[PDB]
Symmetry: D2
Subunit: 379 residues, 4 copies
């Protein structure tokens, strides 16, 4: 279904393009093809359903004469369902123009405060007039949850990590705020993200939610195809085999972001960086979680300090010195390595490192700048 | 009203110099400040996630003094806290007093890292590996308490649904219009007055949670003192009596923000604006919800269109013309009314109007600007 | 040259799209076609040149084996020039990958802090070693001005209005901060903007600078084709003739933004809104400057107060009441007018009004809500 | 040092309660506060646009007292101001004292509208229509002065080029890295120390303009008191003498931000960090510019790679390993060094390193987490 992941990509790109480009896409695919992709997105982002009794909420999408109706069913502790049925008597209604809802789910930039949709709230009550205290309270909560799933309002990544139950926040690690600092500027971008290391898929769900325009790719040596869903593809590949990493990029890249949360075997960490850093988009970010295995013999680490050559912390110390390559003394001719030339910033926190890729060539300090505090006070 | 002033001082110090925050912590001491910080964490960490009774420790240290609290989180129960030893509690959070004051009551971007210490299950009941439940419940518990320890931007739409106010999710779709016009004040030490508590107080709790540095005032003719809590005061007064409005501003103001969600009686709406707009902070905002009563005879409205003089929509039309007062023809002798002079922006949406106060005096179009082809030809 | 304005539009849309879409565009057009469009943008945004003596700054762009060199000449009070020449001995150099510079000029989202470009600063001095105090100071300022013209760092619209010398700020009007409040959320969007009312073109230059991804359209009844340049097209049309307004939208729309700063003849103001409001993109903004003519008989206004029917302020009072259409009593059946149905917000300041377009259908207050303060205290 | 404390009080009041700002304006009075506000407007409106001698009036009123200033703008000349009558000056700006204090020294989104009054050429010298020059020069003059009256975000890259500092535009490309790591402090009442004034002071003026609410301290072994101005103090001290560093922090600190742009002598860089990092605000930032001297023997560096122990790059490598201190093998008896315990983030770019201070104590990976297939099999 690599024709089905290209259709979502096309809807996502048109959502941040010209009116003409969005008009040409909605013409070609039609309402009947696009609507179910939008309904899938609403179910995924409106979860979890509030603590309420089975309540129906209607969603209608219109585009150039055509209109399609869906009814969503919300109930405490249950998966939100949708069926293509008439709105009929359902007293909780949301209406969208197709172009508005595509921009509301997949558009970049500030969410719209007002005028993106129509709404009908209990204009008729099963009560007859003033609704039951239950019907009214459950009604507010139901239609609010669906509207929340219809947009791209900024989510709190700390809560998403607790909600999807990933170890990225709340005990073993405190990463998600640093992910907001370094990946936040890409939330609006149509990104392709690769997480090495997927039982599992929690963190993949979190990235699908955070990057509302993203395609999420989960790489593991074991099959995880049962996690596959819209904008979330799992791939089988070994991070210790350069040819399998290349095949992953050849098929699903290039990636704006690559996160190594895999085996944490020092060798694997080093191979994934050497192979994938060159394939990462310039201006993109490479992340390595779980630095601690640097010191664990069972992960190809050494239990010494300073960290032993060929361990993740030793690597981070060499990358750090690599950023200053232009200022280093070089006997005769020298060309900078790929990592010296393309790593413009290294962010080191407890148990995690962020590698900014970019052109690292500002030129070293000119020869005409004094190389002693002598010649300064002598001028 | 001596307990309101102590919180206000902790809030202001949180946004001041290191010297000013050092002076305050020295004067009041940890013992007096700590319970105020614990009260906020309980208020903002709510609600407990769907888990079994789990204990989380919060330790607060200042200049050699340390005080420990243990919080109890359980599915569907109010979060509790007791000043207890933390020795046997394997989920712990550690804060310096100046850090926890800024985290709760500081303006400025939430700190991503290094604000606190944390001990997560370094020891387990089993003593070799924690159960699937113990670990999962642990993550949720310490996550909920940590979210309560800071001022990370909340989604005002979700706050309205959580606090079960009618400001979002059916009758009204206001909260993003509030984010648009009040958002720039989230970091400010605001005093906000909401006229009409309506049982009730939902929107007061919403504003308390949104304005992490704010003092919230709920004004109603009926007693609502059963809602009173830290940073939330209810005042008994009538929005139809200018002297009772003035007494509210004389005691609890001035207000940065004033919202009219009261009786919606056209006369009351007009009296409240005439009395309180002149007392509102310059650069502050005055809001009128539920404009529809303009058309309801039972609210002192007229069921006609255009809206009848003395109804809220007619008032908003005259305010709109008032902003152009310098361009209107009149005698030089003309002096602008308080509203003509002090209303610089009027924002009209469905059933809500936002009034920006400021100096409306840029000068009318100079007399040397042509007014016809009569003047262009010369 | 409506094939030349479509080429810029294509470069702008690809700048905020997928890697594949940007790769396909740079392949089709090639470096030789794209580079001059990027050089034109750099000259336009690097102005004004600093108060310095004739200094040369080199800019090189590379894409898949091909590389093109340009040398820009900056001098106090003179137009910045560019020639396609070799960098040769020029000691002030900036290098870009084509894809980076397209995203840097036309990309949406946070400017890149680091790694977007290469630079060589006076590695050789005409001096021989430590440069002349003039050469060094002039060098800093020259290469800084060109780098500033190579990005999309947020400009201060108040300064742009003073720089291009438009009456939108600094005496007669104080508009530009309110334009930032209402149009700021579109700066990153590939917008088509129409200003009715163009001697002149100052404000058009300002919009081209502010919307770094925008196409600017200046409508006037007189010819202004001498102002035409990249992303800035002038059109001849009368704002009192609905058929000429339609022709403008048919050819160059739809517009995200429409500003009426024209004749200020009340009739013209009313005709432009009635015709163009329906053609404006939903979620878009319609602006009317110079409300004062409401009261000037020479502009079809009346010198009375309240303002006379058929004058701009009277219109703004009816639009304001129009937003509450659902709450108004309607004898028998009624359908809301286009303006009641599609105006979700009205912003009225001194001498200017902002009209937000959107779906205005939340439903009026349900019949089951009490219509007396009687039935409330009786429940 | 009594003049620094008066500005600090006006800055803090600007970000406090209406009551606190009312107390301060009452105590000091308009006569004492006004010249401080005029000094800022001259500093921030600079430079005058390319125009002929044009006069702009600024009137400041408080509780019935009003004081008028006339500013003179001319192409290539320092902007002047005199407390003069404004009767004959047709370009005028009017401000209430509380508004002009917030506009200059307030945190929070620049006010779009209603902060001030303005009179623009309601009367002309000609008395029927102003010349092309008179009008054009007027727009520019009153525009320049209005830009100086507020705190609208400046482009730190343009500030560096305007103030002619080497932090941007050739030798270094630092300023966007400063926007990234210091930007969240623009609104805060910071005390920033820049070690090394280098004639000089350009970067001090840049920081003064950027941190509109900040007090800027320039530390150098040579006298630089000729640069001293409002919100800008130069201190004589040696970054190689821990007792002289401590005296700087004891007199003018604590500092939110400390930048090392001094001698670049490896030993001095190490001594400055060892002494001042412990005194830096928690949640504050320590910056080291010009890492290249790591490799220069004339700076106490070694011309080898990897960098030699006791050189700046070796220090940064050890700090990086220091952040993982909890995961390193050692005896339980191990106690973390000040830098291991208090360095929570290290940001390395070309020739510059940013050190985040905070509590680095989240706990190392629990002992119950498997360390091999040896443990996975059980
Ligand atoms: Mg992990
Ligand atoms: Mg209500
Ligand atoms: Mg005009
Ligand atoms: Mg330097």
């Amino acid at each position: 279904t690599t024709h089905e992941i290209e259709t979502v990509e096309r809807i996502i790109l048109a959502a941040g393009s010209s009116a003409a480009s969005l008009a040409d896409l909605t013409t070609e695919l039609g309402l009947a093809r696009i609507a179910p992709v939008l309904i899938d997105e609403i179910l995924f982002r409106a979860e979890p359903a509030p603590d309420i009794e089975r309540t129906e909420v209607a969603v209608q999408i219109t585009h150039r004469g055509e209109t399609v109706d869906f009814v969503l069913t919300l109930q405490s502790g249950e998966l939100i369902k949708a069926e293509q049925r008439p709105v009929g008597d359902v007293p909780l209604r949301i209406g969208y123009e197709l172009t508005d809802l595509i921009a509301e789910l997949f558009g970049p930039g500030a969410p719209r405060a007002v005028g993106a949709r129509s709404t009908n709230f209990l204009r008729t009550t099963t009560s007859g007039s003033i609704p039951g205290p239950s019907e009214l309270s459950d009604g507010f909560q139901a239609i609010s949850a669906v509207v929340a799933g219809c947009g791209h309002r900024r989510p709190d990544l700390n809560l998403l990590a607790s909600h999807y139950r990933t170890d990225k926040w709340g005990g073993l690690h405190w990463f998600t705020p640093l992910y907001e600092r370094h990946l936040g500027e890409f939330r609006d971008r149509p990104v392709r993200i690769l997480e090495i290391g997927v039982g599992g898929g929690e963190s993949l769900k979190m990235w699908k939610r955070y990057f509302h325009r993203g395609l999420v790719f989960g790489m593991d040596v074991f099959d995880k195809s049962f996690l596959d869903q819209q904008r979330l593809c799992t791939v089988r590949a070994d991070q210790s085999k350069p040819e399998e990493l290349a095949a992953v990029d050849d098929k699903y890249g290039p990636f704006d972001i690559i996160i190594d949360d895999g085996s944490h075997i020092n060798g694997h960490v080093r191979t994934s960086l050497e192979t994938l850093f060159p394939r990462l988009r310039s201006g993109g970010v490479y992340v390595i979680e779980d630095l601690w295995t640097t010191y664990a013999p069972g992960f190809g680490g050494q239990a010494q300090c300073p960290a032993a050559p060929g361990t993740t912390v030793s690597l981070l110390k060499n990358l750090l010195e690599g950023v200053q390559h232009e200022e280093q003394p070089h006997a005769g001719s020298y060309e900078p390595s790929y990592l010296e030339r393309n790593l413009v910033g290294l962010h080191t926190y407890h148990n995690i490192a962020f590698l900014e890729k970019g052109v690292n060539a500002e030129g070293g300090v000119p020869a005409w700048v004094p190389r002693s505090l002598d010649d300064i006070l002598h001028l």
